[PDB]
Amino acid sequence: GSDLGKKLLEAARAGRDDEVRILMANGADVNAADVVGWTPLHLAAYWGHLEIVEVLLKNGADVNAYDTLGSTPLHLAAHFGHLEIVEVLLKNGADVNAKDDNGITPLHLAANRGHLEIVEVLLKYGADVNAQDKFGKTAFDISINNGNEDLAEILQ
Amino acid sequence: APPAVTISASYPGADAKTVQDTVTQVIEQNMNGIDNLMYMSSNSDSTGTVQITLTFESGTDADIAQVQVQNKLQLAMPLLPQEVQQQGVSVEKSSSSFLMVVGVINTDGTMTQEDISDYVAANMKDAISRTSGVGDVQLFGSQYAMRIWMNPNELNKFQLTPVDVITAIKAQNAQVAAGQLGGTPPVKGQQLNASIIAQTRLTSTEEFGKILLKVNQDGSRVLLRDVAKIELGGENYDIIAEFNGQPASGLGIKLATGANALDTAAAIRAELAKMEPFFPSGLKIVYPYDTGVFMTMVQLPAGATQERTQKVLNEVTHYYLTKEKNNVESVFAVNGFGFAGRGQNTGIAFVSLKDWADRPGEENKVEAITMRATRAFSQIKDAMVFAFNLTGFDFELIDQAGLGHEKLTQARNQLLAEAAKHPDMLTSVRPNGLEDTPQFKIDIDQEKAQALGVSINDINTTLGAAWGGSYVNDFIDRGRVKKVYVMSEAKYRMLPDDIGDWYVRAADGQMVPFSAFSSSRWEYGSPRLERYNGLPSMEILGQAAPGKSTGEAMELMEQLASKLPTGVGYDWTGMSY
Amino acid sequence: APPAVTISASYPGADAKTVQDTVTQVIEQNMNGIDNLMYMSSNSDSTGTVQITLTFESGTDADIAQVQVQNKLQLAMPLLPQEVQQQGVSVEKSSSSFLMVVGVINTDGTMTQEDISDYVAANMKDAISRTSGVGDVQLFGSQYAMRIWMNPNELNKFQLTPVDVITAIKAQNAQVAAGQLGGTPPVKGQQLNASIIAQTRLTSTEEFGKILLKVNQDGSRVLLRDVAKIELGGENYDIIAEFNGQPASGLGIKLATGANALDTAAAIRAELAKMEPFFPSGLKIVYPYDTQGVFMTMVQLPAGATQERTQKVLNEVTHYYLTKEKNNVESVFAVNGFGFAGRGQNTGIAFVSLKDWADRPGEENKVEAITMRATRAFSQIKDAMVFAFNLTGFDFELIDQAGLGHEKLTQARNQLLAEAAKHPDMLTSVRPNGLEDTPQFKIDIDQEKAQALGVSINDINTTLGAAWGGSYVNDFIDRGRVKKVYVMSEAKYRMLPDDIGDWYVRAADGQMVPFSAFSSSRWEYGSPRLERYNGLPSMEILGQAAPGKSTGEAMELMEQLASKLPTGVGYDWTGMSY
Amino acid sequence: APPAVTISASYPGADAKTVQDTVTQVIEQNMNGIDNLMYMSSNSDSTGTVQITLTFESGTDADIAQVQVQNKLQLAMPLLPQEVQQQGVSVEKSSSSFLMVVGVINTDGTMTQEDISDYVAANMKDAISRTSGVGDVQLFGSQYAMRIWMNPNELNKFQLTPVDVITAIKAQNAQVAAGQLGGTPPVKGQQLNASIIAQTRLTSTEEFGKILLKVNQDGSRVLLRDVAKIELGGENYDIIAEFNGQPASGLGIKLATGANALDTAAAIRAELAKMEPFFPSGLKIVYPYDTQGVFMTMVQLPAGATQERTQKVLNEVTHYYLTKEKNNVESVFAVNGFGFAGRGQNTGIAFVSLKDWADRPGEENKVEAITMRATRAFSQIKDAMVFAFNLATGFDFELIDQAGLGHEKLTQARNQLLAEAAKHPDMLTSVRPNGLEDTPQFKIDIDQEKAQALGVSINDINTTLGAAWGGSYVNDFIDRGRVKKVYVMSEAKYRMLPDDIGDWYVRAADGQMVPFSAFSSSRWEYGSPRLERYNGLPSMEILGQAAPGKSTGEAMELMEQLASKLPTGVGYDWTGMSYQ
Numbered sequence A: 001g002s003d004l005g006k007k008l009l010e011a012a013r014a015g016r017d018d019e020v021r022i023l024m025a026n027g028a029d030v031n032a033a034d035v036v037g038w039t040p041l042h043l044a045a046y047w048g049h050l051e052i053v054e055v056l057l058k059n060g061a062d063v064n065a066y067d068t069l070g071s072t073p074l075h076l077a078a079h080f081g082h083l084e085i086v087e088v089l090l091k092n093g094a095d096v097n098a099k100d101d102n103g104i105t106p107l108h109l110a111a112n113r114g115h116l117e118i119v120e121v122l123l124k125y126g127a128d129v130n131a132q133d134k135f136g137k138t139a140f141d142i143s144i145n146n147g148n149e150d151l152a153e154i155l156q
Numbered sequence B: 001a002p003p004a005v006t007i008s009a010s011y012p013g014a015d016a017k018t019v020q021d022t023v024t025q026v027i028e029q030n031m032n033g034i035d036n037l038m039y040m041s042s043n044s045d046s047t048g049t050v051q052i053t054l055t056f057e058s059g060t061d062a063d064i065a066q067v068q069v070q071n072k073l074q075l076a077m078p079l080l081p082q083e084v085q086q087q088g089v090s091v092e093k094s095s096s097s098f099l100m101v102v103g104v105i106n107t108d109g110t111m112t113q114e115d116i117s118d119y120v121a122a123n124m125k126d127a128i129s130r131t132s133g134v135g136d137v138q139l140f141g142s143q144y145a146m147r148i149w150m151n152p153n154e155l156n157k158f159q160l161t162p163v164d165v166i167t168a169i170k171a172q173n174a175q176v177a178a179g180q181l182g183g184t185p186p187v188k189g190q191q192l193n194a195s196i197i198a199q200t201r202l203t204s205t206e207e208f209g210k211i212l213l214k215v216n217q218d219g220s221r222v223l224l225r226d227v228a229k230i231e232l233g234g235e236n237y238d239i240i241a242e243f244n245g246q247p248a249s250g251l252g253i254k255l256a257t258g259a260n261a262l263d264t265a266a267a268i269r270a271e272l273a274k275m276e277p278f279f280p281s282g283l284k285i286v287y288p289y290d291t292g293v294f295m296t297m298v299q300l301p302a303g304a305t306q307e308r309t310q311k312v313l314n315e316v317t318h319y320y321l322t323k324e325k326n327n328v329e330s331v332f333a334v335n336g337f338g339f340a341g342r343g344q345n346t347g348i349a350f351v352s353l354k355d356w357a358d359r360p361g362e363e364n365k366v367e368a369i370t371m372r373a374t375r376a377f378s379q380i381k382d383a384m385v386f387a388f389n390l391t392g393f394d395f396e397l398i399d400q401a402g403l404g405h406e407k408l409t410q411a412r413n414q415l416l417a418e419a420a421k422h423p424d425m426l427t428s429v430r431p432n433g434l435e436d437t438p439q440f441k442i443d444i445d446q447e448k449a450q451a452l453g454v455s456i457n458d459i460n461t462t463l464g465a466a467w468g469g470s471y472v473n474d475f476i477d478r479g480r481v482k483k484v485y486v487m488s489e490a491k492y493r494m495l496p497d498d499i500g501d502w503y504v505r506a507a508d509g510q511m512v513p514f515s516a517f518s519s520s521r522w523e524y525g526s527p528r529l530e531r532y533n534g535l536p537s538m539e540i541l542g543q544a545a546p547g548k549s550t551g552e553a554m555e556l557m558e559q560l561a562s563k564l565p566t567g568v569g570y571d572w573t574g575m576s577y
Numbered sequence C: 001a002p003p004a005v006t007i008s009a010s011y012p013g014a015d016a017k018t019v020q021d022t023v024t025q026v027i028e029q030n031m032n033g034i035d036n037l038m039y040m041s042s043n044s045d046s047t048g049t050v051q052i053t054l055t056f057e058s059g060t061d062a063d064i065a066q067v068q069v070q071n072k073l074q075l076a077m078p079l080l081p082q083e084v085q086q087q088g089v090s091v092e093k094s095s096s097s098f099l100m101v102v103g104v105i106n107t108d109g110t111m112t113q114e115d116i117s118d119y120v121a122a123n124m125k126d127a128i129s130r131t132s133g134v135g136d137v138q139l140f141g142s143q144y145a146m147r148i149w150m151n152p153n154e155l156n157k158f159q160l161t162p163v164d165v166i167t168a169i170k171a172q173n174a175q176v177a178a179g180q181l182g183g184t185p186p187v188k189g190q191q192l193n194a195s196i197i198a199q200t201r202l203t204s205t206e207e208f209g210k211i212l213l214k215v216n217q218d219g220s221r222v223l224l225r226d227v228a229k230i231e232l233g234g235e236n237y238d239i240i241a242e243f244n245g246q247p248a249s250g251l252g253i254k255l256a257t258g259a260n261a262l263d264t265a266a267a268i269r270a271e272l273a274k275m276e277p278f279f280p281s282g283l284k285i286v287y288p289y290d291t292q293g294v295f296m297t298m299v300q301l302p303a304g305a306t307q308e309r310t311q312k313v314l315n316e317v318t319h320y321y322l323t324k325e326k327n328n329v330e331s332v333f334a335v336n337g338f339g340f341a342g343r344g345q346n347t348g349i350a351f352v353s354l355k356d357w358a359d360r361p362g363e364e365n366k367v368e369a370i371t372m373r374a375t376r377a378f379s380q381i382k383d384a385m386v387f388a389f390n391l392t393g394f395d396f397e398l399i400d401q402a403g404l405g406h407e408k409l410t411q412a413r414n415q416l417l418a419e420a421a422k423h424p425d426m427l428t429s430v431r432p433n434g435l436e437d438t439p440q441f442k443i444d445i446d447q448e449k450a451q452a453l454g455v456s457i458n459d460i461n462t463t464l465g466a467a468w469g470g471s472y473v474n475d476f477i478d479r480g481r482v483k484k485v486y487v488m489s490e491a492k493y494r495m496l497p498d499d500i501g502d503w504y505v506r507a508a509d510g511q512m513v514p515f516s517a518f519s520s521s522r523w524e525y526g527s528p529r530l531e532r533y534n535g536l537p538s539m540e541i542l543g544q545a546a547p548g549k550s551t552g553e554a555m556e557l558m559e560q561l562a563s564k565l566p567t568g569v570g571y572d573w574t575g576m577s578y
Numbered sequence D: 001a002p003p004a005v006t007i008s009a010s011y012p013g014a015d016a017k018t019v020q021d022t023v024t025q026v027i028e029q030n031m032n033g034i035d036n037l038m039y040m041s042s043n044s045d046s047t048g049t050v051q052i053t054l055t056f057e058s059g060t061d062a063d064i065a066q067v068q069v070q071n072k073l074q075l076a077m078p079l080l081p082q083e084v085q086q087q088g089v090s091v092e093k094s095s096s097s098f099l100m101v102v103g104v105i106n107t108d109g110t111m112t113q114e115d116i117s118d119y120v121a122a123n124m125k126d127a128i129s130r131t132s133g134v135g136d137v138q139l140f141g142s143q144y145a146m147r148i149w150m151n152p153n154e155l156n157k158f159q160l161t162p163v164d165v166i167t168a169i170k171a172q173n174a175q176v177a178a179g180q181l182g183g184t185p186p187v188k189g190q191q192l193n194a195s196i197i198a199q200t201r202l203t204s205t206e207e208f209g210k211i212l213l214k215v216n217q218d219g220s221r222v223l224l225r226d227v228a229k230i231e232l233g234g235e236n237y238d239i240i241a242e243f244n245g246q247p248a249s250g251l252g253i254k255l256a257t258g259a260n261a262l263d264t265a266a267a268i269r270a271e272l273a274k275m276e277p278f279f280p281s282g283l284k285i286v287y288p289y290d291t292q293g294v295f296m297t298m299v300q301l302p303a304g305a306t307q308e309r310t311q312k313v314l315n316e317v318t319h320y321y322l323t324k325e326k327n328n329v330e331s332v333f334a335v336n337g338f339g340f341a342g343r344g345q346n347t348g349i350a351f352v353s354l355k356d357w358a359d360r361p362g363e364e365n366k367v368e369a370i371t372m373r374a375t376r377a378f379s380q381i382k383d384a385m386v387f388a389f390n391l392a393t394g395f396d397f398e399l400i401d402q403a404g405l406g407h408e409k410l411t412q413a414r415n416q417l418l419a420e421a422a423k424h425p426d427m428l429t430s431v432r433p434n435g436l437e438d439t440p441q442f443k444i445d446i447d448q449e450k451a452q453a454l455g456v457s458i459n460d461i462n463t464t465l466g467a468a469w470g471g472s473y474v475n476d477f478i479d480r481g482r483v484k485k486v487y488v489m490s491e492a493k494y495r496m497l498p499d500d501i502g503d504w505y506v507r508a509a510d511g512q513m514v515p516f517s518a519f520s521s522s523r524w525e526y527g528s529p530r531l532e533r534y535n536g537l538p539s540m541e542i543l544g545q546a547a548p549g550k551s552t553g554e555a556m557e558l559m560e561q562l563a564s565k566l567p568t569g570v571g572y573d574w575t576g577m578s579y580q
């Protein structure tokens, strides 16, 4: 596709908000994907760069882009405790029950790292509380296994 | 220059964090009671390599330093993983540079670099090691290993795994004491005395191919060649070397302390002349460096492969061999090697010039050549490629409070972003190391493995042995002891989907695929972890702006450094100590 | 002084005889071919520890001696138990006395004695140990390990044993080399190269707690936290320290043979000044013993004395310096469990620091008079040798020359001591330097009964040892630092003889078998500290010339007395008497 | 003479090739990057022994040479077989020849050769070995081990194997770390603190004999003494010494490189003086070789020769000095199974001590005249190189395999060079190999397909074979307070003839006893009982003399012309006297 594709992946990767605007403006493919299938929105979501997430979404970035293992930007934001990104992704239409190749959902991941504020927002937006991964496990099983009583309360 | 000792260890198939936390930390923690130590630095990388460099006070006797470091390392050896102990952990004086680099090439296209490396190992290196005034000699490549390249589909067909393969090779490529008939103490009057000779080490691909893995219930035999391809090959494949586009190996030769350079160089050249009658066809000796060699760095992006780097190095070689045909004798292209990082995405070209007197005029001097090379290489896409001939400062950012790699990177980026705000005082303030890159995280599900009766050892040996390789034991090749390695044939260990082609046998004999008890995902992590005086570190280089002193640049770095998050410290090293 | 090289090694849960016979004898037998060795001595202790002291002729290059020693030891390492090898054997070339002590307290009481000791172990000790001139560093405390405190009732409920716990920890707290995607040699056209990351070391009690021991036949899960309490705690619990009565830890530092005291102390201070800014709040360095304005006090209780009775005596010592001598004494740093020469529940040391000389005017407020008064004040403490000393009669070794054994050598020692007590005009205070035998719990495993039940001896001995002695399983990463993991019974299931009967082992047929079905036990005596001298069993005797009598006359009488000892008992002079 | 560091290792029951290929080569490959090294040589023997000699430039600091050798050795140590590591690999910096021999005898004849050798190993050797200036100490004999001599009929009668014996010994001769009652951290208030003492090492044959191998279904017990004889005995039985025909042991002592001979000898005597008052009755030190006054006699039979045939030649030598030279000779200390090239069944040595200078008047009664007559009298002993001498025109030649030709081709080549040197008596005298010839060996092939089919494991097959016919060091025990080894091996009468292979049974997975003959075949073949290597390549040392009046220079030069015509791949180098 584009040389600016790769520059945008790199700039989103490294949190360079200004370099990201300038590249958006010059036609850089907003859904350019690297070798593992990560888009700028994936990278910005994983590394916690909120402004870049926002700029990209406004420029039409595919909110539900999936990587080669089926994981979406919301999987990454939920897993790495980035609350304000989780909220924006879900507001711009992120699929709250997206499953990866393993059947893992953003809820499973937030639950596993005990990100409680994130777990609440996911349930706010309709996250399926009884979704099973390929092993039969729910967010509730994950709370029991990790002995995280606060998270057990929240999932009843 | 202050004397330095380097400890080198290798853990095949290990990632940077595995190496650090099972080797590097353990060794660092045992570097006490050593005299005259100024500082210690280490790096641990994704090629399974650790290097710990100890730097001693100027005037320290380097041999005493070496021996003290050695003894402490050797006492710590039982604390290290078996796989690392079996590779040898070397402790060498690292301060000195090469007397000469000797290239060994094949010109008539009959021999791979592994063939050549083996020839050198077996016929050349030892006679060079014993030559007058020679010290350390490094081989560039290895002697052959017997390579067993496994096929998962054939293994699953016959309900076998890599574990069965490794067990069978230990059992059938063996050599043990069997005693004697009529040995002492004997029945008195015994006339017959003879050694008993039982199994002996295997000597060839044919013999390995006949290893019996299993007799089926129908009475058919499964032999090792039915689940694997079998060849003599390299111990490892991280480096590809060419000399003017031809396959190469070589020797890196060091001068013994208090020996003469010119007499040693002539004594080596003489010794190498004696061997020339015995070469096979087209083997040839070349001398890329001997007491105007410059270098060209090649750096591809995160995740880039050996083949992509090779393509770029090939463009670099072709350029010097055509656009500088009047100036350039040779290009020695080393794919997988850099200073500041090994890996599939780096390489370095050693360019050797023709004589001063055959390059008249300033256009044909090194400085003009290098600037032209750099201008030409600037229009290669998706590679940074820099020609250079071999002031600054050397800073270490230090994790002082158990912050972890991720928080240390964020502090590093806080300092680098601040140093950029003062271009009046500082320029080119940059990491010396590497950035985190995508990695494939596989979780084994312990409950599923238990339910199914799949053992975790079987799981982890199957994954490790197939995808990383395993040094099983030794064999004898044309009378010389050499290693035996099991690994997946390349096309079954390339991509995530290949993980599910590998099967493990449960306790009830059913074959279970990897996907039944595992899940995976992409994440970032480090391909090269750095430590300084036993603590996690990130080295940062830089220089004073124009018309400012190094001392002034340092003062600002310290001041910027005082504003970093809690638990982040620093120290000055190297040129800046 | 004759240079001394010291080898130290450890075997967790081993008694003196075990240490002596699997470690000490083996190292000793292999100290051949070393130049200028004058003599060799060793202790094998019921703390699971051995110290071998090799003393070289005067003028020997200590560098060379250390190296020659380390090289012989390296060649013997494969003959030692895996449990000892894996602790790390150390070899040192240093003074036996302390150059200085670095104390560490928490001024805001935010951190316990145990937290502080770990902070010191984990953040300060190694850089101090790498400082040039630093010969030996003793932590006055222990680094944390991950402690798995097993409950035998809960293990038996789920038909598990410590063997199953250990197996599961090694399998689930693992660091796995998994290779790469697109690894070399690659296929043609490969675009992706990435490390594969599988299992990594666990980092938290949470993680160890969810180690999955087993899935019951009804599908429920038995996690490690269901049979154990999981906490960070010391690799050992033997050494506790206080600074002016407050919780403390610290580093006792000994000068490397031939090093410069003053430069080494300065380098140590320079290194501590690099660490101070990153301390957690409250943490503070104090300087309780800088070597004339300082002295020590030794506390030796008889073997068999416990941590609490040693503590009681240390409290009396500390109290005296902080009440009676408060106009002269600035501080006391007291260590329970360490005693200058040796390490044990029955021993302690106090490091005393005086106020400025200028503010202690008068002969009666100088070191000599103070130590002398303190020795007098402590001379009437019951069943404790307590003495204050700044830092010569005779030093005698009774030697087992003919395989006589411990018991006979003790009788022979006692005969010589009794004979020497009957010459009070010639000899004074002729005494053992070592320890008396004490009660020990002898347990006999019935091999016939184990085999009849299908119980494996290795499971029995691993069960006994791991529970009652502790077992170092493998390593984990605590806040980025490699540290150890230990399994052991929780305290309350390993206190009394009846507790033996509550440990169960699983037979080949799946039945749980109590230890009482295949064992029997009795009380007996044995040694908490076995000594050797030049490779043979030995007993060190100290003493002096009586008043008005020469050392050489006293020695001559000791030789006379020694010549009438039972057959096979020899002797030799060492130390000051060589 | 140039300084030499020596690496020595042992692999019990190993043949020469096995030693070479699992031990010697692995070490050798690391011996480079060592300062002032001139050359390296090695022997790998069918006694299961390897010795590598690294020879340094004159004036090299021996302390540093030893250090640097050992640091390269450490790279090979974890690649070595565990049976080698466990024997204790040694690295020494000694002179190659003896400074003195300390003899030990029992004037009351109440102790055998075996008893005496054990007493010396257990109470005397270590302290000598620790003495400064002592480079190497050789025991003429062997320390006692606990010997379990297995009987294969009795083992098969109870469905047991050596694997079971070895397993039981490891389980029941054990030293257990069992912790404490009331240890730390305690329940606060705990008063009781006591060490737990569980199993401890066995100390006696009686305790070994009652080891419980199994309980039958009927409840009867199979004890280790029901399948083996149990006694104290040598770790090995290869070295046997006599002093004036009387049972003896001793220490052969070599001087550490650069150490003072007088000083060192004196400290050895001082240390012996500490031991003497505690000797059992009858025991006494004798001094059969102080370094004219003395000389040695070397005895070398051809490979294949047993202890019996070597003893015979030694008796003829000893008989000579006690009958014919009885007015000159005070004492003969004769050692069967150890000679100049170290250990082997076909070698021996006599140390001869003469009476006082002044009780031997006349030039024919001096060392030179005596050794000449002895060498003369011994020259007609057949199948024996016997000579007497007291400690030059010669050359030291190394034939080297430089192309992977293998041992058989290198022999062929050697024979070709030796035959052509025989046709030049004008220039070359006594051109001979320094080494040993190939001898018959019993080659046994495990059939993997049969083993797998019957369900017998290969480790079980190999242990059974190795332990029975070679012996196996199981673990340690305590003999009269001293750590010592425990060995299992077949009783002699079950490991003497080829048919004995078939009386050893291995137990399959299904419980069936399977004789060795069901999964094995065998044949005679030839191989080497001493493989030599020079600078890391297979080699064959050839010795010889400049013919009368001709220079070493001219004889060396001829040997080069002869060598130049040898097959492709075969090279040479000069070592020792010929190096410079």
Ligand SMILES: CC1(C)Cc2c(C#N)c(SCCc3ccccc3)nc(N3CCOCC3)c2CO1
Binding pocket: B097, B098, B101, B140, B141, B239, B240, B241, B248, B249, B250, B252, B288, B289, B293, B332, B333, B334, B337, B350, B352
């Ligand atoms: C003096 C200089 C700068 C010159 C110099 C040259 C040249 N010319 C080469 S040539 C490439 C040889 C080779 C062949 C196969 C595999 C790896 C390397 N290689 C060097 N290396 C040093 C570290 O190990 C290998 C690379 C150096 C470093 O010192």
